[PDB]
Write a protein that holds these residues in place. Structure first.
Motif, mmCIF file in Angstrom:
data_model
loop_
_atom_site.group_PDB
_atom_site.id
_atom_site.type_symbol
_atom_site.label_atom_id
_atom_site.label_comp_id
_atom_site.label_asym_id
_atom_site.label_seq_id
_atom_site.Cartn_x
_atom_site.Cartn_y
_atom_site.Cartn_z
ATOM 1 N N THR A 93 -8.785 -3.826 -8.145
ATOM 2 C CA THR A 93 -7.457 -3.999 -8.183
ATOM 3 C C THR A 93 -6.784 -4.552 -6.838
ATOM 4 O O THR A 93 -7.696 -4.669 -5.752
ATOM 5 C CB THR A 93 -6.762 -2.767 -8.417
ATOM 6 N N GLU A 94 -5.433 -4.729 -6.552
ATOM 7 C CA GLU A 94 -4.963 -5.244 -5.515
ATOM 8 C C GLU A 94 -5.168 -4.608 -4.401
ATOM 9 O O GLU A 94 -5.366 -5.303 -2.953
ATOM 10 C CB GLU A 94 -3.601 -5.661 -5.927
ATOM 11 N N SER A 95 -5.039 -3.374 -4.207
ATOM 12 C CA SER A 95 -5.250 -2.425 -2.983
ATOM 13 C C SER A 95 -6.336 -2.458 -2.336
ATOM 14 O O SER A 95 -6.788 -2.520 -1.070
ATOM 15 C CB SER A 95 -4.740 -0.974 -3.330
ATOM 16 N N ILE A 139 -7.510 -4.022 1.407
ATOM 17 C CA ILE A 139 -8.151 -3.170 2.341
ATOM 18 C C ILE A 139 -9.396 -3.834 2.842
ATOM 19 O O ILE A 139 -9.825 -3.757 3.916
ATOM 20 C CB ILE A 139 -8.224 -1.807 1.690
ATOM 21 N N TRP A 140 -9.992 -4.541 1.911
ATOM 22 C CA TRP A 140 -11.242 -5.214 2.421
ATOM 23 C C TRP A 140 -10.895 -6.393 3.290
ATOM 24 O O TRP A 140 -11.599 -6.492 4.026
ATOM 25 C CB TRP A 140 -11.786 -5.836 1.078
ATOM 26 N N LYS A 141 -9.692 -6.778 2.978
ATOM 27 C CA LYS A 141 -9.322 -7.942 3.801
ATOM 28 C C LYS A 141 -8.810 -7.417 5.153
ATOM 29 O O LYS A 141 -8.662 -8.040 6.308
ATOM 30 C CB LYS A 141 -7.992 -8.733 3.007
ATOM 31 N N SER A 142 -8.276 -6.018 5.297
ATOM 32 C CA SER A 142 -7.974 -5.539 6.467
ATOM 33 C C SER A 142 -9.070 -5.541 7.637
ATOM 34 O O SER A 142 -8.670 -4.995 8.648
ATOM 35 C CB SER A 142 -7.342 -4.187 6.327
ATOM 36 N N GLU A 143 -10.165 -5.606 7.198
ATOM 37 C CA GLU A 143 -11.463 -5.518 7.983
ATOM 38 C C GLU A 143 -12.257 -6.690 8.571
ATOM 39 O O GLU A 143 -12.533 -6.823 9.607
ATOM 40 C CB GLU A 143 -12.340 -4.489 7.152
ATOM 41 N N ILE A 178 0.842 -1.273 -0.052
ATOM 42 C CA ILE A 178 -0.020 -0.020 0.110
ATOM 43 C C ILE A 178 0.938 1.259 -0.013
ATOM 44 O O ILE A 178 0.602 2.165 -0.765
ATOM 45 C CB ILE A 178 -1.160 0.025 1.127
ATOM 46 N N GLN A 179 1.986 1.308 0.773
ATOM 47 C CA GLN A 179 2.816 2.348 0.854
ATOM 48 C C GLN A 179 3.813 2.518 -0.405
ATOM 49 O O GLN A 179 4.072 3.563 -0.839
ATOM 50 C CB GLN A 179 3.773 2.433 2.000
#
Lengths: 240, 48, 219
Positions: C166-168, C172-176, A84-85
């Protein structure tokens, strides 16, 4: 005039333009008629084979040794944060190319772009070294559980189809994972781990069979036994 | 802006449009104080 | 669709008919046909606008880099000529030390998006048909129908979960708390739909916890 109203029972109510409606459901059946299903699009969260395999694989990794679990967690989280960074640092490349499109050789924006691209190349090489330094370090400490989780994913889909001859043969998944917890918590098997894997699948088939034959009717245990044997070892009865 | 006459055929309809759309309203040939225009001239605002 | 066209031509239209005639064997209401067309038009518009934005930014980059190189290829020579008849080289080389990777990176995407936006309509057809039909079926029917449609178009590569997200956003969805299966991620992609209301069949409440997690920001 300029707005819109919508009917809710008896009232007349202004339909605000920021209206978004979602709604959850706890049972796949109940309830749709064929009239309220051509306007409502239906989404079924379901447990499938390849997901449940990885779920039980992660449970076995967490119950083998906590250090490999903490390592595979921290490495993946740091890899995601670095990705991400890295996207954030490469997100200034449009600014460094055409932020103003003038005096790009004059101002020090091209000087700061050199520092940003240096940081990007450093993070890229560091992420290459990190993705090399996690692959085989996780594969050899994670692949020592999957011949357990493969047949443990077989057994649930064996015992799922037991309702279709007699009702109230409906089995949950939370109690199934409670059983998979009970397989560790009562084992205490100290051997070779490759000698432990057949021991744990052996002492799990007993607990599954006893837990299901607590429930069954007395004229059904032979049915359950033969369908269970057809489910676990499909090679010993060959073809046709 | 809309400007309307007192003895006019479309009085209450145009009055409704002027209250809804937020116009600035001028009335021509008033012969006094209309019976209709009392809570609008006062403050009578129920909230929704 | 020919009245949703102005408001190859016949191959699209006869492909629509065959997709619908194959999908009649699971329940095919004409409301779903019209939902299909509207979400096709919406996704095709949003992706055409985003691809034109990407080519615009890449074109601006390819203009500015070439202009600055053409300016820097003669300025030190002009200063040397003025010194011959009678201080930006270091920062120019420092800029070139980043530009050797940067221009080499930002080169190819011009021709890439140029060849991509000739293959947008069939991709939008597949992406709309998946949303407007197959959020109900089991995953074997997802695999069989996507394979038959993909062979029907003829582009046996060219997946869709990377085409549409896309991957980001995935991480981010997986981060929750979103489940990391193919099924859960495709189901969270289908609730992009806003023509209708989504209906969450959900035995264990993780997906609902995720949705009411990342819808924190609005009211």
């Amino acid at each position: 005039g300029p707005r819109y109203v919508v009917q809710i029972g008896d009232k007349i109510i202004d339909y605000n333009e920021e209206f978004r409606l979602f709604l959850s459901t706890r049972n796949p059946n109940p309830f749709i008629p064929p009239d309220a299903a051509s306007i409502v699009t239906e989404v079924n969260f379901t447990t499938t084979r390849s997901g449940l395999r990885g779920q039980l694989l992660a449970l076995t990794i967490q119950h083998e040794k906590p250090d490999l679990e903490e390592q595979k967690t921290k490495l993946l989280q740091q890899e995601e944060d670095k990705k991400i960074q890295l996207a954030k640092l490469e997100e200034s490349l449009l600014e460094t190319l055409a932020t103003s499109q003038g005096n790009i050789l004059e101002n020090k924006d091209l000087i700061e772009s050199l520092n940003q691209t240096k940081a990007s190349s450093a993070l890229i090489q560091e992420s290459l070294k990190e993705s090399y330094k996690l692959q085989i370090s996780l594969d050899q400490e994670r692949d020592a559980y999957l011949p357990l989780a493969e047949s443990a994913s077989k057994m649930y889909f064996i015992i799922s189809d037991l309702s279709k001859i007699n009702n109230m043969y409906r089995f949950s998944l939370a109690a199934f994972l409670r059983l998979f917890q009970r397989a560790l918590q009562n084992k205490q098997d100290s051997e070779n781990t490759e000698q432990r894997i057949q021991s744990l699948i052996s002492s799990l088939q007993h607990m599954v069979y006893e837990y299901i034959c607590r429930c069954l009717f007395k004229a059904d245990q032979l049915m359950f036994a033969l369908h269970f044997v057809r489910g676990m070892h499909p090679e010993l009865f060959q073809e046709n | 802006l809309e400007v309307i006459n007192q003895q006019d055929s479309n009085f209450i309809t145009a009055l409704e449009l002027a209250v809804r759309f937020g116009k600035t309203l001028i009335i021509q040939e008033m012969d006094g104080v209309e019976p209709v225009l009392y809570p609008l001239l006062r403050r009578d605002l129920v909230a929704q | 669709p020919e009245m949703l066209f102005s408001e190859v031509d016949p191959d699209f239209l006869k492909s629509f008919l065959l997709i619908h005639e194959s999908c009649k064997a699971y329940g095919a209401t004409p409301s779903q046909y019209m939902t299909f067309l509207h979400v096709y038009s919406a996704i095709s518009s949003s992706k055409k606008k985003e691809l034109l934005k990407r080519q615009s930014h890449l074109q601006a980059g390819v203009s500015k880099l070439n202009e600055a190189k053409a300016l820097v290829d003669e300025l030190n020579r002009k200063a040397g000529e003025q010194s011959v008849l009678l201080e930006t080289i270091k920062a120019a080389e420092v800029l070139i030390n980043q530009l050797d990777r940067e221009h080499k990176r930002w080169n190819a995407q011009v021709v890439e998006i140029t060849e991509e936006l000739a293959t947008l309509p069939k991709r939008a057809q597949l992406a709309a048909a998946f949303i407007t039909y197959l959020s109900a079926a089991p995953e074997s029917l997802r695999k069989t129908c996507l394979e038959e449609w993909t062979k029907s178009a003829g582009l046996e590569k060219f997946d869709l979960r990377r085409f549409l997200c896309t991957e980001s956003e995935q991480l981010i969805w997986k981060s929750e708390g979103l489940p990391s299966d193919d099924l859960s991620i495709e189901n969270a992609l289908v609730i992009l739909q806003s023509r209708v209301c989504p209906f969450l069949i959900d035995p264990s409440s993780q997906a609902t916890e995720w949705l009411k997690t990342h819808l924190k920001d609005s009211r």
